[PDB]
C-alpha cells in the first residue's frame, strides 16, 4: 500500500503481468453457451428387431438391470421397453461423479451380461453413451432435385461427411440422422410358396453365399525344404452388388431349372430401419447432431465445421444441400458481444461521471486503467480454476462492475478530496487517504467474500450454476481490492495533479464548469437535512420497519424461476395422434403443421424440420415432432414476431382444426431443465401386483389429483395407454403332428413380419447390414397370415391356420421401470397459486392411500430439489455471523457492526419493487443481482461508519458531529458510483431481441436495487450508527 | 492403487478370455468385484407369524431386496444366505425310461415350449400407401 | 452378507444400506422382519 | 509391397450337384492349408492348444489342391478339381 | 482370423476409427491392417495426458464400435491398452 | 521436432519480457532494464 | 493384514510336477516343521 506509493514501477510491473496472464487466458479459454450443470447420466440402448414391449423387457431390460451393481455413485436408474423393439436404460450418478468412469463401470458390467441376452440382440449391439442432450449444432442435409431419398442421403452423409466432421477440431460427437445403407431383401410369399421355400431357406442361402471363409496360404510355415513361393489363399469373400444377392441359388428343381433370390424377392439398397421419416420444408432430410468437445471453443468449432462443409460443397451429387436448423453459436456470439459492450460502456460512464464531477482529465484515467487490469485478471483466475467463458460467467462479470468500479473510484476520490480539503501534495495526500481506507477495504473484501462464497456451496444442478457466479464475482472482487491496495494508489500518487486548499472549483470556468456551485448547495442541503432528522430518531426506525415488512411481503408474492426463456431463434411443436395411428396419418398432420408455418408465418419461419416417428412421449408411427427454425431477429421487428407470440397462436391454430393433439412451445435455456413450478413423480410396484393392477392404482391417484385443482394442475402420466394387439397361438400338439418345426414356424413369422438381420456385406468398401423382411403388402392386415407357409419334414407346405390360432387383446406398447421395479411416471405441476413443495406434499399424501403394495418416489428435478432445499437458510446464516465477526474485527465493537448490517434491506426492497412492477421473476440472475446490491450497500456503509468512528476516536469529535462530517465527505463517491452504475445498466433494463431475457433479469433488479440502496442509505446509515452508538 | 482402474484394466483382460469359457460358465454370469474380504455387516430376515419357509424368505430377499442393496454405492459385494426361486423340474428316470425319453428331450421341449418370441407388427414400417391399422403381433411368451 | 467396496466409507455405506431397508419395510408380506445379527459399524461410532 | 494372392472359387452350384456339403469343402481346405484350432489339452499341467493341419508337403503349391478329397452325401470321394476354379490376384498385406 | 488386409480394413479398422472421435487430448492416430487379419490402431495423446483416462475414454468409444464388428472379431476379444513402441530389453534363451 | 521449432520464438519472447519485467520491479528504474537487455545479443552471438 | 506372530507361506510347482508330487513335497515340509517345535507352531495346510 505505502510500499507501492514509493514504487510506481513495481506496481506497473504487477499490473502488466495480470494483463498478460489475463490476455493469455482470454485467448485460449474454452467458450460454450453454458457449462456442465446436469448430473452425469449414462444411457444403455438396445434393439430387438420385431420385439414387443413385453419381449424386450423380460428378455433384455430386466436382465441388464439385474446386472447393474458394484457401480459407484449411482443416484437412480430408470428404463423403457417399447414395442418398436427398443430398450433404453438410464443411470444417473451423483453430482461431481466422473462421467468417464461412470460410463466405463456401466459398460463392462453390461459386458458381463451380454452372454445372457438373446443372440438377435447381441448381434444388433448394445449402446452405452453419455447422455448430455447438449448439441453445439444440428446440420441438416437435404435433396432438392428429388433424385435421392432420406435413405440415400443418410448413406451419403455416412460415407462422405461424418468421418470428416468428427475429425474437425473441437468436435466431440457426431450422431447421424438416419442409417448407413442396408442390403434389403423384401420377400414375396406367393413366389416362396410356388417353389415350396420359406424365409428359413432364404436365410440359409444368404449365410452360405455371403460369407467370409478362412482358408490358408501357399508356402505357409512350417514349409518344405527349399520352398519357392508364399502367398495367401483367398477363398470366399463377402458379396457387394445388389445384383450379386439376386444371383444366389435357393433351389434346383427336379428338371434342373434354377431358383434364385431374385425370383422370390425384391432386392435393393435401403434403410437399416424405416421407423422415422424426416423432412426439411417438406423435402427428404438427413442430418448430423454435433456435440462440442470438452474444453474447446464453441465459436471456433462452429467456424471450422462450416469451413469443412464448404470444402465438400463442390463434391456433392446434383441436388443435395447443407442447411443449419440449429446452431447455438450465433446466440453465444450475441451474449459475449453484449456483455463486453456493457463492460466497456460501464468504463466510459466512469470516465464521464469522473470527469463531469472531478473536472480533471488525468484523474479520470486512473479507473480507466484500473478496471481493465482487474477484468483481465479475473479471466486469468477462471482459467486457473478450469472455468470457461460462458453466459453464466459473462453475466457474472457484468454483475460485478458495481464493485470493481467502486474500488477504483473510492481510492481516487479520497485523494482528490484530501487535497481539496487540507492542501497536501499528491503523494502525501495519497499516503494519508489510503490510511483512512486500507483497513476498511481489507475488511469489505472479507465481508463481500462472506456473502458470495456461501452460494458456491449450494448442492445439485442449481449449485453448479451458482458456483459460476460465485467464483467469478469472488475472484473479481478479490483482485480489485488487491489493485486498490497496489496499483490505484501508485497511480494516485504519480499522475495526479495537486489541488490548493479549499478549492471546490466554485466560480472558475465558464463554458465548461458552472455545476460546482449547484452541487455544493445540495451537499450542504443534504447535511442540513440529516442533522435535523437526527433529532427524533425513534420515528425513522418505524419507516424502516415498514421497509422491512414490505420486503417480507414482496418476497412471498414474487414467483420463483430458474433462468429466463429466450427467443433463441428456434422452437418446436409436437404432434400426437391417438394410440395405434399410422405413420401416414401422422405424416398428413405434420404436413399441415409445416403448411401453417410456411404459409401463415411465411415472413418469420425459415424452416420446419418434421420428424415423423420420433416423439417425446414414446416412439412409433403414432407420434411425430416438428422443429422450427426462424429468420433471425433482424427480420422479426415487433413483439408478435418473437417466439413467445408465434408459438401461442400456433397452439391456438391447431386446437380448432385437428383430430390429434398438437402442442407448441419453446425450449428452456439449459436444454435439460424443469418447469420451476412443476414436478416429476414416479409410481412404483413394490409387491407382486402386475402391470394392470398398477394401471388401476395410477388411475386412482390421477383421479384423486383432479379432486384438487386448487393445488395440482395438469397432472398426467408420461407413459402410454394400453393398445390392442394381435396374438397368434401356435398349437404345439398340432404342429408336431403335421411335421413342422417349432423354430421354422417362429422365424418364418418373425423374418416376414418383423425383419431379420442376417448378415454383413461390403458396399463400396464399407461393411453394412443384410436384412430379410416381407414386402410391405404381405404383412399389413391379419388376413395376410394366410399368405405364409412353412415346410414340414415330409416335404409338403403347411398354412399357419393348420397349426395356429389368433385373437386380439390389450397389451402395453411401453413398459417402464424405476430402480429395477415396474414403474409408471407421472408429471404435473403446482396450481397457479401454490408452490412445488406444497404440491409435492399433497401428492405424497394422496399416494399414501393407494392399494397395498404401491410405492412412489421423486425423480429428476423433484429429486434434485429435495436433496438441496434445506440449504438456502443454513448457508446465509453462516454468511451473517462471519459478516458480523469480520466487521467486529474491523472496528473494535460487538455493537458497531449492527449499524452497517442494518443496510441489507434498503437495497433489497427496490430490487423487489423493480421486479414486481416489471412483472419479472425471482430467478438466478435476480439472486446474484441482489447480492451485488447488498455488496455495495454494505461497502457504502462500512466506509461511512469507519469515517465517523475515526473522526470520533482519533480527533475527539462528538457522535452527532462526526456522523455529519462522515456522511458529508462521503456523499460524493456514493453518488458518483451510483450514477455510473445505474447508467451502465441502462440498456439492460429495456432490451429486446437475443439474450434479452437474462439481460432484463440482471438489469431490472440491479437498477431498482441501486436506486433505493443509495437514495435511501445516505439518510438511514447515519441514523443506524447514532441509534446503535447510543446503547453503550 | 486406484481401485477403479485396477478393475478396468483387469476386466479388459478377462474379456479376451471370456469367449473361451464354456457356455454354461458364461451364462451363469462371470463377475468382477472391487471389495473388502471381510463382511461389513449381515442383514438377516425372519418371519414372525411363521407363514413362510426359509426358501420363501430367501426368494423374497433375492427378488425384492438384493438388487437395490447391491446397487447401493459403496456396496462392493452382496452374498445371499439362501437362493432365489427357480422353476425346478425334478426328473424321474423310471418314468423317462417308461416313455422312451431322455433329459435331452426334456431340455429340448422346454426351450421350445417356454420362449419369448419377436413376431413383428401389423401395418409395420415401411407400410403400403393407405394403411389404417398398426399393432404389435404377439406370439409365444415365457411361462409363469 | 455385505462387503464394502475398496476405499468406500464404512459408516456412510451402512447409513445408506439402512436407508434402503427403510424404503422396503412398508411393502413386506405379513409379519416379515429385518433383523441385525452382525454389524461392525455400531462399534466404530461408539468407539469414537 | 503388394503381394500375389491365390483365389479359389468354390462353386456352390457344382458342389451340391455332386452331393458334397458346402461346410465340408470349406473346413477341409481351411484346416489343411491354414490349420484349425480344435480345442485344448493339458500338457504337463498347463492348458495348451490342439491344432489340426496338413503335413507341409501337401500344402505348398497350386497343384497340391488336387491331393485333397471331400466326402459326398452318398459316400464317395470328390476332388476339388470337380467344384472349384482358381486364379491369381493382387493386394497389399499391410494397409496403413 | 484368415481375412486379408482389405477385408479387415473396411470390416474392422474403419468401423473402430469412425467411433474413435470425441476423445480428449488426442494428438493423432495411426493403424495397420494385416494379411493375417490383425488390426492395430494407435491413439497417441497430448504430452501430460493421464494415460489411464485415455485408456478409459478410448475403450468407451471402442465399445460402441463392437456391435458393428464381425462376430469372429468379437469372439477373438478386442484389447484396449496403454502401449509402448519399442522394447526395453530382449531376454534371450538358448540350450548349451 | 516440429513442435519444438514452432514454440522456440515464443519462448524467447516471453522469457525476455519476464526478465525485463523482473529487473524493473527490483531496481525501481524503468530504463535500467533497457541497458541490461542490450547485453543479451553479446552473449547470444557467442553461443551461435 | 496381520496376526500377532503369524506367517503365510506358499508352496509352488515350478517344473510341471503335478498335484500329487506337490502334495508329497508339502507333507515333507510339514513333517520337518513339526521336528522344530521350539521355532514353529501349528504349521498347517490352509487348503483342502
UniProtKB/Swiss-Prot annotation, chain A:
Task: Tell me where it resides.
Answer: Cell inner membrane
What's any GO biological process attached to this entry? response to xenobiotic stimulus
- Stretches assigned to the Periplasmic side: 28-335, 385-390, 457-464, 555-870, 918-923, 992-997
Per the record, the domain of life is: Bacteria
- Keyword terms, alphabetized: Cell inner membrane, Cell membrane, Membrane, Transmembrane, Transmembrane helix, Transport
Transmembrane domains' residue ranges: 9-27, 336-355, 365-384, 391-412, 438-456, 465-489, 538-554, 871-887, 898-917, 924-942, 972-991, 998-1017
Q: What is known about its induction?
A: Positively regulated by MarA, Rob and SoxS transcriptional regulators (at protein level).
Q: Null-mutant phenotype, please?
A: Loss of susceptibility to contact-dependent growth inhibition (CDI); inhibiting cells still contact the target.
Write out the similarity annotation.
Belongs to the resistance-nodulation-cell division (RND) (TC 2.A.6) family.
Q: What is the protein name stated in its UniProt record?
A: Multidrug efflux pump subunit AcrB
Source organism: Escherichia coli (strain K12)
The primary gene name is acrB
Swiss-Prot record, chain F:
Mutant lacking the gene: phenotype: Loss of susceptibility to contact-dependent growth inhibition (CDI); inhibiting cells still contact the target.
- State where the protein is found: Cell inner membrane
What does the record note about the induction of this protein? Positively regulated by MarA, Rob and SoxS transcriptional regulators (at protein level).
User: TM segments?
Assistant: 7-23, 34-48
Ranges in the topological domain labelled Cytoplasmic: 24-33
Role noted for this protein: AcrA-AcrB-AcrZ-TolC is a drug efflux protein complex with broad substrate specificity that uses the proton motive force to export substrates. (Microbial infection) Involved in contact-dependent growth inhibition (CDI), acts downstream of BamA, the receptor for CDI. Its role in CDI is independent of the AcrA-AcrB-TolC efflux pump complex.
Q: How does it assemble?
A: Homotrimer, with large domains that extend into the periplasm, interacts with AcrA and TolC. AcrA may be required to stably link this protein and TolC. Interacts with AcrZ. Part of the AcrA-AcrB-AcrZ-TolC efflux pump.
Q: Which family does it belong to?
A: Belongs to the resistance-nodulation-cell division (RND) (TC 2.A.6) family.
Protein name (database record): Multidrug efflux pump subunit AcrB
Q: Which organism is it from?
A: Escherichia coli (strain K12)
State the gene name recorded for this protein. Answer: acrB
